[PDB]
Paper text:
We show here that when long wavelengths are combined with the Mesh&Collect data-collection approach and when a genetic algorithm (GA) is used to compile a data set, a native SAD experiment can yield a structure solution from microcrystals. Furthermore, the GA algorithm can effectively generate a highly complete data set from hundreds of naturally multi-oriented samples collected at long wavelength, thus permitting the compilation of a highly complete data set with high multiplicity, and thus preserving a weak anomalous signal and enabling structure solution by standard SAD phasing procedures. In summary, Mesh&Collect data collection using softer X-rays extends SAD phasing from naturally occurring anomalous scatterers to micrometre-sized crystals.
Data were collected to the maximum resolution possible of 1.929 Å owing to the geometry of the camera and the wavelength. The data collection (30 grid scans for 298 partial data sets) was completed within 2 h. The autoprocessing routines could index and integrate 180 partial data sets out of the 298 that were collected. The aggregated data set, obtained from the merging of 116 partial data-set wedges, resulted in high overall completeness and decent data quality, which allowed the location of the anomalous scatterers, successful phasing and structure refinement using standard methodology. SHELXD correctly determined the Ca2+ and Mn2+ ions and the S atoms at the Met42 and Met129 sites, producing CCall, CCweak and PATFOM values of 34.2, 21.7 and 55.8, respectively. The anomalous difference Fourier map peak heights were 46σ for Mn2+, 27σ for Ca2+, 7.5σ for the Met129 SD atom and 6.3σ for the Met42 SD atom, as assigned using ANODE. A best weighted mean phase error (wMPE) of 34° and a CC for the partial model of 22% were obtained in SHELXE, with 119 amino acids automatically built. Cullis values calculated starting from the Ca2+ ion or the Mn2+ ion alone were 0.90 and 0.89, respectively, indicating that in the case of proteins of analogous size but lacking cysteines or methionines a Ca2+ ion or the Mn2+ ion alone could provide significant phasing information. Finally, no evidence of radiation damage was present in the electron-density maps for the crystal structure of ConA.
Residue numbers in the entry: 1 to 237
The structure:
Amino acid sequence: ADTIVAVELDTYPNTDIGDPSYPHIGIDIKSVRSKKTAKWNMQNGKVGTAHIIYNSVDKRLSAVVSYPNADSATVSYDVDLDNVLPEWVRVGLSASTGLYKETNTILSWSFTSKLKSNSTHETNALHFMFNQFSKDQKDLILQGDATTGTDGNLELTRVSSNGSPQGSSVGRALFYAPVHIWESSAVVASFEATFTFLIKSPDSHPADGIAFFISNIDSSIPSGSTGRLLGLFPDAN
Ligand SMILES: [Ca+2]
Ligand SMILES: [Mn+2]
């Protein structure tokens, strides 16, 4: 199976797999059962922003999610990602719906990784920023139902022509180039990610959520990962 580290924006509480009884943000280390969660006052139909940060000295994966005019939600988990992830990874966004549904629209996405080595004022770095997506976005690997270009957005899950989100959908977008998160001469490794999202649902119970994830470079959507598994995991272990 894939190796997955993710920050989940979980819109639907599945209490039998350890979700709290409310929408929440969580840190997932190789399991959909988050190592840490925090309550998330999700807003149907409003544009939100998520930030993810980590560095190899502090070994703490942290995330913050907010909306304009509202307080934020934050979650952190102490973990050495070099003991979890391989040396080369791909980064991406994932989303799903199940019997309950929502739009999982990405309006922008940025990522920065830095490897600071032993040699004088070195730094290896990768940075990308999307503030709009075109219909043929060649530097994204789209998987499942994900599409780009509709209103210049990245639609991670299926939406009808009338704009209604569809259930039982799963889709991901990974940045085309592999990302180097560890090197033998590196003295500090760090990354940060930001994405803005629009989760819209005609229903009182939207599902299932959006995640920023880091994976083995050849990661693909696991079989049966619609719904609560967020397109990231093959089971709820
Ligand atoms: Ca859930
Ligand atoms: Mn959850």
